[PDB]
Amino acid sequence: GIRKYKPTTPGRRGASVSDFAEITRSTPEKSLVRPLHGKGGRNAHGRITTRHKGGGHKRAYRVIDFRRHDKDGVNAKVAHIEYDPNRTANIALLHYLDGEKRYIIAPQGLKQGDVIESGANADIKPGNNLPLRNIPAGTVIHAVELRPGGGAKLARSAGVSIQLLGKEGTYAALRMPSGEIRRVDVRCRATVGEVGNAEQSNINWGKAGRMRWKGKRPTVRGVVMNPVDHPHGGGEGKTSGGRHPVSPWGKPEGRTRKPNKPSDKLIVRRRRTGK
Amino acid sequence: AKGKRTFQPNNRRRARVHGFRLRMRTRAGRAIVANRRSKGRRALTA
RNA sequence: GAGUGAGAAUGCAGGCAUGAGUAGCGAUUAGGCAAGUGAGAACCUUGCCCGCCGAAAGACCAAGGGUUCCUGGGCCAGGCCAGUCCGCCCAGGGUGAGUCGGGACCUAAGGCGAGGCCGACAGGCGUAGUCGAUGGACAACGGGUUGAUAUUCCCGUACCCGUGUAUGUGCGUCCAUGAUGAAUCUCGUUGGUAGUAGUCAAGCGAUGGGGUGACGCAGGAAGGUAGCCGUACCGGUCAGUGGUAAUACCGGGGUAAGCCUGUAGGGAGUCAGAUAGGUAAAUCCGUCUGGCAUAUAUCCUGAGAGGUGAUGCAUAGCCGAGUGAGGCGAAUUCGGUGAUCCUAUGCUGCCGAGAAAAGCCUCUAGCGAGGACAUACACGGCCCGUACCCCAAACCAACACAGGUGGUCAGGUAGAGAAUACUAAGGCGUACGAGUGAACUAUGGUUAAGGAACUCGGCAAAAUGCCCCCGUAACUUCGGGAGAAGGGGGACCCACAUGGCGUGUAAGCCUUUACGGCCCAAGCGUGAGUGGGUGGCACAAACCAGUGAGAAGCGACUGUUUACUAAAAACACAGGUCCGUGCGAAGUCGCAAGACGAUGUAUACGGACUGACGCCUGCCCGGUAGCGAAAUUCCUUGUCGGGUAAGUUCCGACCUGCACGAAUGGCGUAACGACUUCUCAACUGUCUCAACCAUAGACUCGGCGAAAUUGCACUACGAGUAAAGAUGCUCGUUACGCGCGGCAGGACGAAAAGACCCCGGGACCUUCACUACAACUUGGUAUUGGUGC
RNA sequence: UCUACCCAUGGCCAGGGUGAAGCGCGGGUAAGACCGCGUGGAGGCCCGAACCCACUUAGGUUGAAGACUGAGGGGAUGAG
RNA sequence: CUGCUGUGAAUCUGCCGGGACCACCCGGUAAGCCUGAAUACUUCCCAGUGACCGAUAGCGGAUUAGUACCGUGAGGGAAU
């Protein structure tokens, strides 16, 4: 849910926070926690390769089970649902009956004590993870793999999900959270259900302080920058650049995807751009 | 005021930024050491 | 044969002048006297007195410095003066660690990285590793001592690994000593070999694994302790004053780690069976399955109190051995107050969700007929730093420089306080002085009568200022505005008051007999109220300490910004929209590998632009077609008023005609603002209009002692003339020579080879200027087989 | 070693104030939004030191200082 | 003559050069080839020379000289 702050301060006026109502613990699993230090958006060269990144609250990585293949036929119980700093959705600490503990992206509607199944024989219920070959068509899945055994990569953000439109041969058509139609091998695994925490997109962060906590540094506009700094830089007043939009490196707006990619043949219908 | 001068001494940092090991690390620094040795510097480096 | 001739190059070097015996002699504390030393003393020593700091200007750590430390000498350099002195000069001495801070122990960011991958070469990355504290682990505290070191040395008492001895053999051996199924008949059983043979049984025992071991921010409350204030008691003073002989006053009224105990607080179910999930194995962890109680039970952790340590140590004081080194040495009780410290990595809340090594179990394995375990003896178990300075004269600042420099401790009285004032300890008077009522400058102070009339502008100053009672508007996003505004009181003494409150002596409560609870005389602290009275001009009497109100614009807001003239309306921002990106994504850094993005995945990332929040559709949004209302102020809108006596900013109606500018970029918008502008109340030396006082300069004397500038010089004025603005030229006028203190009209004064303007060149920026290059398609190379065609 | 930004690991922020949800209710109420009294202690919250800054003014301007001082001023639990 | 890219020759009736080609011709026998001494320079050492300098010259350096000093550093760099 969402808890809206009262306007006791100018920085809290329209602000809201996650109503952490699905969270069952305030701490992670110490065995599954890993160190995670900030980068500032800087690569191995020390250069800022991604701007507007830095500061931000310290985070600890929770090892997520995106490649859910080892526990094939071994059931788990939803031990807890926990906050994860490193993703918009909540994580679900599972207790595999064999005695192993792992984190997964907490799907929508998952509660503590629920039983989760993995493998072809798993029931089609939220949290269960079985290959697309065994997931029936016209169902809402998430945490879908791109290649068999490669680990979940698609629709793992809070509230997102993929529609398994159909299966033909050794491929399955998926409608992505972006509306794109893409084929992926049926041997790719996917967890059933949506991703939980769907309301998090409605969080109003209220003040610059919240985004500085989240690690987002302020964004300066090119039309404000000088001509040397940005192509939009200059003009007596906040211009629009004197021309159509371009990036700080001069790249104009337009499809930036590289052609001749091997996935061009897998992608059926790309996303609908403002229709 | 803000009367901080440019030079803030630090022996460890001096050694780690201009020291003999750092100079010998790169060919350019080795070149600097050799050039100082040819010039006759008593202090080839920090 | 020339390195052959200088006066110019804002030339170069060295030595000097001119200003000049001139400025200055470096804060906002302050010195004085007596004596000493000495050739010489404002400055050094000693004794007083005075003054300054006292959340430091006291005492330490760290960095940095590097001997500056101590002793003895020196005084021609330095010290802004002098100097006998010194951080200066010279010699000698001085730095003592199992425990402190580091290494020998860990790792974070990051560095380097065997191989390796990538790259024409150079090299770029990077795995394994290995470094890398600012963090983790890790054993010591009091007292004394030196001229200089001290958790280091010494004293006392503590805590971390080994060798020779003794206590037990806690179990097993060459035997015996327990557990296990050891076996026959589309299977069967016990009917043998065969409960023998093997395994575990010992005593111990990872580098290897496997698992616990491990962190945020805020907020109290409680219990303590340090500290502080008293007090029993103890030891002393009479400080030439009116009183004051113990009733008064002054000093003490101390003592650590360790060890013992285990209190307040905090956290905890426990015992079996199974299990490969933790790569193998585990008895460990995890999961599941059960049994029992969830209790004033038990177990961990744990401030503190108490005991010991402590018959020691230390201490007020005592006498005299002034080499002043010595000895002797009392009391030490209770209370109040009380931490920013401890319990506490606790507890509670919250979202922004908070870094491995040792430690402890487990096992595979291992030594081993014993070897090993614990206990008690006597004996042993590294390197580096350690002086000294460390808000400073020893560091960064060229200087003994008004600047900067992280952390720790944080007495008293007022006080909310770490503000502020004054003070304790402690440390200083800090390095030019003495004088002198000049102007003038600066910093303070006061000011009649006015009270913003000053001025671009209330700049500056002045003013409000605190606590408690009341009481608080428009508007609002319902949070605010707000401490709105406005009003009253505040001191001291007495009584209520042997009060109320907080603490807590005993007796009893139950009793588990406790480090127990409740109450509680007394004692000690202590708020506020009421009623009287007292004094003054004044009771937040000092210091400290909001001015407030109304408006207009801009920007929602807190925040950021041109280090060094711009802090803003600019940037940012939360919200919004658009575009890109289906994932070693896009986008960036790279030749590439690779990296960030992100250990993220369209509720996510990047980019662009807006910049909270609210509003912005008219016949058909089937037609002229984007609407014609309104909030829309260029408005020059005049007209009128409001506001001033004259009133800018601005506020209103009437205004303005296809208008005009915003179907999303224009209008509003509470709050906020060192933003811009204005009007008020108050206030004032801003002003009418200035006067006086003090201090630092200025001035005088003594010492030291520059500077920019300088073609010259016994350098007037007038009217002229001149490169058109003359001390230097003309004709006259004036003027004895030389200073000193002032003023700033000229010397087209100094300063900077004008930034303006032009010309020549440059640089950087823009682009549909030219030409190139980085960044994508075509042909064939890599690469290529048939058939259905 | 200045400075801009970022990363790791530490530290600091005197004092005072205001008072953001769940308990019990008078309630509102069929029931709810929600008013009030207590508790709680949030906030790029308020006043205000240290600390950081640098708005105004005066002085400095061959300075004490190649950017400072005095007096005021801003932030002062945070984007510190 | 030669780099890269593609395509790609026989054996002397061959192939290459003579700044196309019949060739009159001439010269030579690449790619698989490989391999020698006899000319430039002076850190350093020895002996010398100068119509070279002679302490602001001559080396930056006759002297503590790449020292003092300056700079974080590369580096700059004296005077005597």
Swiss-Prot record, chain A:
Keywords: Ribonucleoprotein, Ribosomal protein, RNA-binding, rRNA-binding. SMART domains: Ribosomal_L2 (SM01383), Ribosomal_L2_C (SM01382). It holds the Pfam family Ribosomal_L2_C. The keyword Ion transport does not apply. It comes from the Bacteria. One of its GO terms (cellular component) is large ribosomal subunit. Gene3D superfamilies: 2.30.30.30, Nucleic acid-binding proteins, Ribosomal protein L2, domain 3. PROSITE patterns: RIBOSOMAL_L2 (PS00467). Disulfide bonds: none annotated. Residues 252-267 have a biased composition (Basic and acidic residues). One of its GO terms (biological process) is cytoplasmic translation. One of the primary rRNA binding proteins. Required for association of the 30S and 50S subunits to form the 70S ribosome, for tRNA binding and peptide bond formation. It has been suggested to have peptidyltransferase activity; this is somewhat controversial. Makes several contacts with the 16S rRNA in the 70S ribosome. Belongs to the universal ribosomal protein uL2 family. This is Large ribosomal subunit protein uL2. The lineage of its organism: Bacteria, Bacillati, Actinomycetota, Actinomycetes, Mycobacteriales. The gene is rplB.
Swiss-Prot record, chain B:
One of its GO terms (biological process) is translation. It comes from the Bacteria. GO terms for cellular component: ribonucleoprotein complex; ribosome. Keywords: Ribonucleoprotein, Ribosomal protein. HAMAP family: Ribosomal_bL34. Belongs to the bacterial ribosomal protein bL34 family. PANTHER family: LARGE RIBOSOMAL SUBUNIT PROTEIN BL34M, MITOCHONDRIAL RIBOSOMAL PROTEIN 34 FAMILY MEMBER. This is Large ribosomal subunit protein bL34.
